[PDB]
Design a protein around this ligand. Structure first.
Ligand SMILES: [Mg+2]
Lengths: 252, 134, 97, 110, 55, 291
């Protein structure tokens, strides 16, 4: 069995050296050490920026939040048009309407006024850096595992559960294949019946999932995809118009 | 329904390709002599043998920036520092002590790999980091 | 008075239901997907609030502009009054000028 | 029937003949061209690194984790890594095995 | 439809002949050009006359 | 060699980074001040009676009744017609040289607005009434590159620096629509419109662009040899013979006055999806676009 030896495709800074990870397999219980992969140090050995993780984690948690809480003001509560009793003479407190916020059943003075949006956008480069940092942190704390593929001998979830327990993978595992359509049917069958082992395509990777799961599993094709997408942000001009429109060298 | 007649062509499409911009900053061409007329030098190869490293920016310049707050706080920032940033600080202290007549006031931000100096020293620091191989 | 005399029914949270387990998936759909979609296109909600934020006067103005032709009469009248009210408040009252 | 191996212990103790067994593996992977200063041999080649390190893991039951692989630049490093023992006892066992005085009683309700 | 053609080309299904102005539209374009965008010689002539009056 | 690796190895011995032990950077999250408690409640920072405590003080600029400062100054047309004045993004010979030295502008081919925008050398805002780039002289002493460059305005000393190095410079007018297209061709092509004609200058600019001293693109070519000779005598360099240069064909390339792009004619539709170009052949259309 020839080792699976992955080299980094994109040029590495001369002053830096690649970091490495065992290439593994899910085809048997002991099929660790199937190879050795170089990883780009700028993606997998960047400065550990936990403050940037918090920035990106909070942007994910909040940027799509729409609040639907709403109260009625004194203007919107039913009725309440007339002055309850004369300004002077009664010996009562003076009141203009029975739906003032002082009255039971009155309006709310400074209540929620939804629907309220919380949309904002961290700069693209910050969002790309948060992805690198999460990857660097997973590797550095021995929570990253590179596989050659996600193929299983069976689609039985207990196997994947037992395999993780044997390899000491933690309670939650995040499986990243390169593409949704081209996922092995076996890993699809196993993870669909599980709650803490979650299968996603490469395009769905994010800081919140990587932090929620203890263990991160990446196929080797995924690694090349990630290095390419994230290192592109380091070398790009400022845009002239949205990157969705045609450029000379983009996409690929 | 009569329509104006047209003719498709693929020969002239080279003229459209010449109009598309790139997303990737081009790497600088090779020059027979350095510095270039504009004054640009490439980093030294092999990288200098120092405890710290100063990476160039995406446009291939030395990352020394002057900064200002309150309308009067002149500051120079050195960014993109790798390795031991406390060694870089000592060197900048020794480079700028003669020029100031005293030790410069500095902030070392280990987290961001940034050195901050009180005062404008962008030109001196650029020329000095460029003579180091960075 | 005012304080409950028994413990409330215990609250059980499935931290691994499908909504929580997949939260945040595709928030990098642009930077990982060649920018064919913007992450704001994942936001579901009122047509007038997707990928947009503002203070309450801006929201009311924006809602009136976009769906105001479709609103019920009582609700549209309240919105007209709310805009006028916030217009006076934000433009004429307050500590700072 | 598919049977998963029993959970492998993390405990590791450096063998007394470590340097000898490593030197053998070095010659088995790199040849006998440079026996002198074999400890200074560099592991820059990934195929040789994998062969060396996959051998040590199979034999010694202790593998270099991903966090440390880039640090195994020479054979000195790999030797120093396998010179470090690992303990797999829990904190209760560690504490209870800490020569507790007669008046210190530790219990564990887990 | 012109934008759909530009994004998808022939796959759009737009008849490319509809992309240029029709004869009636072409008459309106040329009329607005004549009224508001004078020839080079006319502008040079205007500058010559205006220059003499100032001189 | 140091702090960089010292942080990742320091992370190995720490608890796992999770959603339970994150925090913002110190100094990034200033606390909210609420009107509650002794320090911040009671009158709550608003003072005591008057208009200020009641939130009803007059508008900005009001001075209590005295005829206000901003009203008692006389009107003067400092800003009269600001919105119809033409603006030109300056391009320095220092900045042009730097772009060439870094490979972002290619001097081996003609340089016009599209190449400067695509090299990210200048940012043009037609909606803010930019009419193009003015070539300014700053950096003329150290400018060595030979270019064929097309700008909208150029200083004599900037022209001398270009022509002393064997280069060519022409000044060309772009109307705001043509300017928007020349600056971002791809967005215009995604409109599916025939390439429009570049309009002529307005009268007040016709003298500038028909004058050889400005190397105007509507200027008489026979008058250029003299004007190029005058600057050489004025500034004390020998005018090179560019007909002898191997790039002479490139140095002569000029767009037709009614042309926005090199090699493309008015009335063509660019089909970027199929990488084709559709040319009309109807006589009325063809006469319109060549006129
Ligand atoms: Mg009473």
């Amino acid at each position: 069995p020839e080792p699976v030896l992955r080299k980094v495709e994109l040029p590495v800074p001369t002053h830096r050296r690649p970091v490495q990870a065992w290439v593994e397999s899910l085809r048997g219980f002991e099929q660790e050490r199937v190879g050795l992969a170089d990883l780009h140090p700028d993606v997998f050995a960047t400065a550990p920026r936990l403050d940037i993780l918090h920035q990106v984690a909070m942007w994910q948690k909040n940027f799509k939040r729409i609040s639907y809480a709403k109260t009625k003001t004194r203007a919107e509560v039913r009725g309440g048009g007339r002055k309850p009793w004369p300004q002077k003479g009664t010996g009562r407190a003076r009141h203009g309407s029975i739906r003032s916020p002082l009255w039971r059943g009155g309006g709310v003075a400074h209540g929620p006024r939804g629907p309220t949006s919380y949309y904002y956008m961290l700069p693209m480069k910050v969002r790309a850096l948060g992805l690198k940092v999460a990857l660097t942190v997973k590797l550095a704390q021995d929570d990253l595992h590179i596989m050659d593929s996600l193929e299983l001998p069976t689609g039985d979830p207990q196997y994947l559960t037992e395999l993780a327990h044997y390899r000491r993978w933690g309670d939650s595992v995040l499986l990243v294949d390169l593409t949704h359509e081209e996922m092995p049917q076996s890993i699809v069958e196993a993870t669909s019946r599980l709650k803490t082992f979650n299968l996603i395509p490469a395009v769905g990777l994010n800081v919140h999932s990587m932090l929620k799961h203890q263990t991160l599993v990446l196929t080797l094709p995924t690694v090349a995809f990630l290095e390419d997408k994230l290192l592109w942000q380091d070398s790009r001009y400022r845009p002239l118009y949205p990157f969705s429109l045609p450029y000379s060298d983009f996409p690929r | 329904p009569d329509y104006p007649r047209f003719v498709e062509s693929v020969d002239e499409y080279q003229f459209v390709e010449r109009l598309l911009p790139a997303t990737r900053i081009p790497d600088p061409p090779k020059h027979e002599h350095y510095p270039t007329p504009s004054g640009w030098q490439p980093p030294r190869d092999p990288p200098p043998n120092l405890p710290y490293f100063v990476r160039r920016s995406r446009m291939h310049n030395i990352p020394v920036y002057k900064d200002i707050t309150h309308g009067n706080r002149q500051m120079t920032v050195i960014r993109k520092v790798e390795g031991d940033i406390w060694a870089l600080q000592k060197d900048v202290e020794d480079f700028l002590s003669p020029l100031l007549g005293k030790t410069p006031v500095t902030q070392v931000n280990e987290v961001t790999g940034t050195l901050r100096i009180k005062g404008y020293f962008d030109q001196e620091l650029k020329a000095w980091l460029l003579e180091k191989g960075f | 008075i005012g304080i409950r005399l028994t413990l409330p029914p215990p609250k059980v949270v499935d931290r691994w239901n499908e909504k929580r387990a997949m939260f945040g998936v595709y928030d990098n759909i642009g930077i990982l997907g060649n920018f064919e979609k913007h992450p704001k296109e994942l936001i579901r909600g009122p047509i007038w609030l997707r990928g947009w934020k503002g203070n309450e006067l801006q929201r009311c103005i924006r809602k009136r502009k976009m769906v105001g032709s479709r609103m019920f009469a009582d609700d549209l009248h309240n919105l007209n009054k709310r805009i006028r009210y916030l217009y006076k408040h934000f433009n004429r009252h307050g500590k700072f000028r | 029937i598919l049977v998963c191996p029993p959970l492998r212990s993390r405990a590791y103790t450096p063998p007394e003949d470590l340097q000898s067994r490593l030197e053998s593996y070095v010659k088995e992977v790199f040849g006998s061209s440079l026996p002198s200063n074999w400890q200074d041999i560099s592991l820059e080649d990934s195929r040789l690194k994998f062969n060396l390190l996959a051998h040590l893991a199979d034999d010694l039951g202790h593998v270099v984790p991903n966090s440390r692989l880039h640090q195994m630049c020479r054979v000195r490093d790999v030797l120093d890594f396998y010179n470090v023992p690992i303990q797999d006892r829990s904190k209760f066992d560690e504490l209870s095995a800490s020569n507790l005085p007669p008046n210190l009683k530790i219990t564990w309700s887990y | 439809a012109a934008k759909q053609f530009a994004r998808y080309g022939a796959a759009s299904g737009v008849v490319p002949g509809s992309l240029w102005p029709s004869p009636e539209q072409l008459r309106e374009l040329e009329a607005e050009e004549r009224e508001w965008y004078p020839s080079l010689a006319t502008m040079q002539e205007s500058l010559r006359v205006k220059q003499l009056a100032e001189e | 060699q140091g702090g960089g690796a010292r942080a990742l190895d320091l992370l190995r011995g720490l608890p796992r980074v999770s959603l339970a032990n994150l925090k913002p950077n110190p100094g990034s999250k200033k606390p909210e001040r609420r009107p509650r408690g002794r320090r911040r409640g009671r009158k709550c920072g608003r003072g005591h009676k008057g208009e200020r405590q009641r939130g009803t003080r007059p508008r900005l600029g009001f001075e209590g009744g005295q005829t206000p400062f901003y009203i008692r100054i006389p009107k003067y047309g400092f800003n009269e017609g600001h919105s119809f004045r033409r603006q030109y993004k300056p391009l320095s010979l220092n900045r042009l040289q730097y772009l060439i030295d870094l490979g972002r502008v290619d001097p081996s081919q003609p340089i016009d607005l599209t190449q400067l925008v695509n090299g990210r050398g200048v940012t043009i805002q037609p909606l803010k009434r930019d009419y193009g780039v003015q070539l300014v002289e700053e950096g003329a002493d150290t400018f060595t590159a030979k270019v064929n460059i097309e700008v909208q305005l150029a200083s004599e000393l900037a022209i001398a620096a270009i022509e002393k190095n064997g280069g060519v410079v022409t000044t060309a007018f772009y109307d705001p629509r043509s300017l928007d297209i020349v600056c971002k061709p791809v967005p215009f092509f995604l409109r599916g419109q025939p390439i429009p004609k570049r309009m002529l200058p307005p009268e007040e600019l016709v003298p500038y662009y028909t004058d050889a001293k400005n190397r105007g693109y509507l200027a008489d070519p026979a008058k250029f040899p003299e004007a190029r000779l005058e600057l050489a005598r004025k500034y004390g360099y020998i005018l090179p013979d560019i007909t002898k240069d191997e790039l002479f064909k490139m140095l002569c390339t000029r767009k037709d006055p009614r042309q926005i792009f090199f090699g493309l004619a008015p009335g063509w539709v660019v089909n970027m999806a199929d990488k084709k170009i559709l040319k009309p052949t109807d006589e009325n259309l063809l006469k319109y676009y060549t006129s």
